[PDB]
């Protein structure tokens, strides 16, 4: 199976391809540079983009050299672009942040710093188990 | 499942209930289907179908003729040569191809244009046919290289056939003796149809009457190397 998750409602995509977001777990990486988004469509000239709860393909630019030369699956857990949930609430976080996982969705690290978004928490049951604040 | 599981399922449960009847009806409809294909297929598919049907008809005729005919080496070779794969084995000193098509210098050479201006010099000529440049070849410098013989058009070996022995061997080319169109083409070593070349015949096992080994002979090129990508020659014996 590919990394695109089912049952995800439409939200504002705040992180296009080329964005650098913080790395919110303890795997050793400090940031993730987005090179691709799972489940992205096909339009001429359109950059692929992801929101909170989406799996992207990311490259570590700052962190351990062991994590440096590989492309990792990551899940976006926080974004700064304001988006709306179905209860009418627009919301945003103070930073863009994601966690490194495997293609099945188990986390590489062991703990998450800071809160995670709801959409990430329902879509990935391991992140819901490793999150200290769900927000 | 493992091993012959579909055959085991065949043993245990069988076919579908209408399998034999459907197969028999399809085999019956084959004649109508083949005539429909012969009359209704279009294009390259129809052409390939026609050639296939022609081949099957010829094979069926041969089979019927053999069945009707059922109720009714060549050269002497020793016992150690029996049951092996052997060749079939079939004054005016004229070559097999005494005349070919003439090639003009406009077809032989194309003009290489040099210079940075809009009007360009045209003194360089490039050979558009395969050539044999010989051994120990070092190219002339570009300021004094008029005739350009490109590296990708150079040849060194040729498929030479011996007419008496009916053996075709790849042999190294020693030299180009006579190009029938032009002595300049002979000097440049152009390999065209009807060209007399000198080939190394060491692998053919030829000795003279004195016992000396003949390792250089004459062959004539019998094809178009520029069209075929290979040099095919016949030994002049």
């Amino acid at each position: 199976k590919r990394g695109a998750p089912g049952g995800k409602l439409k939200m504002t995509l705040g992180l296009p391809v080329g964005a650098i977001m913080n790395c919110a777990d303890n795997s050793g990486a400090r940031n993730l540079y987005i090179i691709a988004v799972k489940g992205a469509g096909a339009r001429l000239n359109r950059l692929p983009a992801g929101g909170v709860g989406d799996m992207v393909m990311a490259t570590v630019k700052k962190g351990k050299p062991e994590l440096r030369k590989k492309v990792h699956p990551a899940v976006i857990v926080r974004q700064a672009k304001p988006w709306k949930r179905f209860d009418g609430v627009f919301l945003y976080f103070e930073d863009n942040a994601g966690v490194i996982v495997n293609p099945k969705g188990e986390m590489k690290g062991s703990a998450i710093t800071g809160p995670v978004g709801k959409e990430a928490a329902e879509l990935w049951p391991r992140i819901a188990s490793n999150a200290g604040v769900v927000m | 499942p493992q091993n012959e599981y579909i055959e085991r399922h065949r043993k245990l449960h069988g076919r579908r209930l209408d399998a034999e009847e459907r197969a028999r009806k399809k085999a019956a409809r084959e004649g109508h289907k083949n005539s429909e294909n012969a009359q209704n297929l279009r294009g390259l598919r129809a052409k390939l179908y026609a050639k296939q049907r022609h081949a099957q008809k010829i094979q069926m005729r041969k089979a019927i003729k053999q069945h009707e005919e059922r109720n009714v080496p060549s050269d002497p070779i020793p016992s150690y040569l029996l049951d092996r794969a052997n060749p079939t084995t079939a004054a005016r000193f004229s070559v097999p191809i005494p005349k070919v098509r003439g090639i003009s210098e406009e077809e032989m050479f194309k003009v290489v244009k040099t210079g940075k201006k809009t009007h360009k010099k045209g003194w360089k000529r490039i050979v558009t046919k395969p050539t044999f440049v010989g051994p120990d070849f070092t190219r002339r410098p570009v300021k004094y290289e008029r005739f350009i013989r490109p590296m990708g058009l150079r040849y060194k070996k040729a498929n030479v056939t011996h007419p008496t022995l009916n053996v075709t061997v790849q042999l190294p080319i020693l030299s180009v003796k006579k190009n029938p169109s032009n002595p300049l083409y002979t000097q440049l070593g152009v390999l065209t149809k009807g060209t007399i070349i000198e080939v190394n015949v060491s692998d053919l096992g030829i000795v003279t009457a004195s016992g000396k080994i003949a390792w250089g002979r004459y062959a004539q090129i019998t094809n178009n190397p520029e069209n075929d990508g290979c040099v095919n020659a016949v030994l002049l014996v």
Binding site: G7, L44, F86, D87 | -
Partner: protein
């Protein structure tokens, strides 16, 4: 040669030409197919768009992620004063199509519907239908009776003529809107008797439509005037400081024919197009005389649908109103035609029943935070002009 990277076409050819509508009032192009085994009913209605507001809905949608949860949705309010039935048209079938055989009008027509037949009503002698009204009195309406019998025995399609009571709206327009509404169901004689029984009578919106029904809205869209290709068709803008213009199409033609194609995006009229938008759910049919028609079973605030300070550029909604989920083609003050769906629905959304929890009645003239003036005064407290008064 071939275009290197494929891309789908900007815009649809199903909506050509991109010209202004031929009439301000929307046209019902098709009515639902007549089934004579159904009881006789009306297939259309009119209203005026008043504005939009917000609701909270307790969603009962099994299989959805928002099942048994509250969802915030946008809705459109249409002010629907009752219509008046004043006419009856009979249609016959011909090898050239449907043809109007005759029509019968009522004995009394209102001034607002007589205004529709004039351009200079104030200078008029208002003689319209005056000789026609004498046909009801002469020979006990023999001509009216024979026209009714002609519709009974020759026609297959019967439509009432119905007009709006525009004087009950806040609009400064006094000239009413008149339309043909098809009677579906029953026999043709039943349709004729039904229309004659409905002559000179008002028909309210809740006897044509019902809450939880999905309808179609027909209207003319917002006009934008003359618009270039970038906004009109959604074409890609040329790079900065492009010669002869950057909000343009670089090639209207590069190949044969030695012509400009009809399929090439060109500047022109944008907006004011006729549109029939389908499958719109009715969330509420609120009554005009009900003073608490914006209240729900869980919101016990006793309030009306009109937002605080009124609808921006419309006024107050004082008649029966229809709440429609989503958006409709037209603008505020514009005439809207509500029509029954032509086919039986195939979704569970049509079978859903709606449970509203709350309706937003705060001001849309700004960032309104209060649903009622009493709520505003309770939050603010005593002011200087309160003691001054």
């Amino acid at each position: 040669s071939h275009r290197k990277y494929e891309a789908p076409r900007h815009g649809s050819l199903a909506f050509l030409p991109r010209k202004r509508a031929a009439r301000h009032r929307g046209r019902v192009k098709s009515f639902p197919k007549d089934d004579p085994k159904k009881p006789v009913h009306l297939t259309a209605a009119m209203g005026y768009k008043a504005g939009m507001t917000t609701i909270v809905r307790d969603l009962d949608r099994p299989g959805a992620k928002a099942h048994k949860k509250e969802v915030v949705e946008a809705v459109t309010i249409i002010d629907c004063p009752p219509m008046v039935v004043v006419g009856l048209v009979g249609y016959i079938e011909t090898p050239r199509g449907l043809r109007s055989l005759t029509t019968v009008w009522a004995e009394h027509l209102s001034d607002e519907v007589k205004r529709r037949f004039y351009k200079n009503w104030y200078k008029s002698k208002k003689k319209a239908f005056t000789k026609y009204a004498k046909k009801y009195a002469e020979n006990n309406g023999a001509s009216i009776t024979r026209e009714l019998e002609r519709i009974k025995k020759y026609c297959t399609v019967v439509r009432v003529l119905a007009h709006t009571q525009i004087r009950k709206t806040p609009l400064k327009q006094k000239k009413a809107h008149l339309m043909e509404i098809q009677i579906n169901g029953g026999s043709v004689a039943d349709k004729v008797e039904f229309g004659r029984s409905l002559f000179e009578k008002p028909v309210t919106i809740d006897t044509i439509f019902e809450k939880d029904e999905m309808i179609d809205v027909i209207a003319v869209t917002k006009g934008h005037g003359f618009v270039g290709v970038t906004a009109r068709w959604g074409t890609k803008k040329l790079p900065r400081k492009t010669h002869k213009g950057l909000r343009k199409v670089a090639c209207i033609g590069a190949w044969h024919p030695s012509h400009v194609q009809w399929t090439v995006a060109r500047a022109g009229q944008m907006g004011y197009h006729h549109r029939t938008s389908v499958n719109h759910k009715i969330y509420r049919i609120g009554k005009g005389d009900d003073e608490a028609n914006a209240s729900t079973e869980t919101d016990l605030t006793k309030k009306k649908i009109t937002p605080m300070g009124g609808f921006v550029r419309y006024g107050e909604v004082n008649n029966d109103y229809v709440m429609i989920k989503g958006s409709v083609p037209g603008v505020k003050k514009r005439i809207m035609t509500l029509r029954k769906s032509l086919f039986t629905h195939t979704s569970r959304k049509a079978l859903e029943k709606v449970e509203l929890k709350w309706i937003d009645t705060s001001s849309e003239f700004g960032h309104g935070a209060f649903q009622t003036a009493a709520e505003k005064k309770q939050f603010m407290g005593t002011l200087k002009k309160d003691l001054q008064t």
